[PDB]
Design a binder for this molecule. Sequence first.
Ligand code: CO
Ligand code: CO
Lengths: 271, 271
Amino acid sequence: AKKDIGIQLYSVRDLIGSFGRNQHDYKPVLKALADMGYTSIEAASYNDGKFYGNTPEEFRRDVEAVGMKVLSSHCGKGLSDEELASGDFSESMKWWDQCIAAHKAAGMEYIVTPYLPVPKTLKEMQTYCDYLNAIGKKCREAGIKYGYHNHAHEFQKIEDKAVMLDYMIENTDPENLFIELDVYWAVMGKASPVDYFHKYPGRFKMLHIKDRREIGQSGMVGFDAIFENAKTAGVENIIVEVEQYSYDVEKSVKLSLDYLLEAPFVKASYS
Amino acid sequence: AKKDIGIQLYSVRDLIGSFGRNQHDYKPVLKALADMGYTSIEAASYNDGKFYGNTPEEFRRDVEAVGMKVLSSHCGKGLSDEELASGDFSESMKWWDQCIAAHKAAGMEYIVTPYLPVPKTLKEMQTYCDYLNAIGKKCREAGIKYGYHNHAHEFQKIEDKAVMLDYMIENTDPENLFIELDVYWAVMGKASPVDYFHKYPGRFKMLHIKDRREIGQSGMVGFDAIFENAKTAGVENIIVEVEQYSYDVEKSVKLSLDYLLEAPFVKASYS
Ligand SMILES: [Co+2]
Ligand SMILES: [Co+2]
């Protein structure tokens, strides 16, 4: 494999189906992704110490057997209304110990929260920032880097004062939280990926390489510019994500990889 | 000059001033642009049969004197509320006669209207299409291609039924109206330039190559994909536009050109 490129498994969710007893039969897709040349995965199916209904140990064996790294995972635990109003998120913090230990057992380097809604107030946003720091701190102590993945909504303002993502970056410690920047959703939020990189150097330790459909197809994403600035950003790993397709899913995710493999501005490794 | 690339003079608006009661002292900037390697200009100052306050003939001599073609111009008479309510745009047509005659005298190959607002109703939008068709027919008769230039707003729906730009394209004869698509604002309007190219092949006879600031800096525009699909689009000429600047204006506009000169997917010519 010429370059280290990750695949988010959410991209292949249609290709994971029940076979006999198995309700999450991901092994055939994992082989297909490895054959294409993907070198790592990011999971999108965590629940109560398990990945795709499997032990972290078995999931990790499955990924490693096709020669890919268990790099990262999307999961999270939002605060209740009461936690958010009180400031007291000790209950939610209990969830994180099991999650962190399972992620570690699956050999994960990163844990990423995929989604938080826009808070109604800066106060609520700040409580979220405290939670994020507490999570990130527990992760770091266990040897895992915790991050946050955007869509488009985080470029909205809270209370017409602060942009959500900006507030989040500014009010979390760099060692507790990096941003897994989705460059497509950033653009969809009228944000410049490169300007974000320059405003917050080192905070973007992974990218979600996403486009409307196949990567580099739409005209909506300046991958050249993005990759040119990956060093300012602090990029360690890149993860392809494809949720809409011009072809069968495998072909779409394959063509998406090929764009990156053939692009001279994508280095063989960022880590 | 390796490649045929034009510049929208609005990009250098700050560098044209009243000096010695030349209300618009554009000659110094014209030379700077030529020296950069721009091969053609699109004007943005038309009034009462003059460009930048000068005769079409003198304006053309000045642009040609530095070795640049007078390719295109931004001008328009927007419909009055009365005209829109009447549905009758007949009073505006006298203005267009002079306009078109002036443009032809200036050497222009294209005239483009830079702005129409989102109308409240589809009935109003149809009046706009009627108007655009009429202008375009007159232009065609005089040997000039007539076009419409978009910002982001045209991607909005009218009456929650039709996207404005889509309606315009569908309800105007291709021979009367092409779209000078601004790829930046298309992206800002959440539109895929390439998907637009494939939906309406041949209608994009010119592109505005725009970014947030310098062309190819932001990460918000997939120029690779756009240029890859230029033939489907129907691109005949490309025109740089820069309205915001990381540097002094001439440097920003120069670096913009350099991006396209160095980019392999930008051909030497689209004629
Ligand atoms: Co994503
Ligand atoms: Co423009």
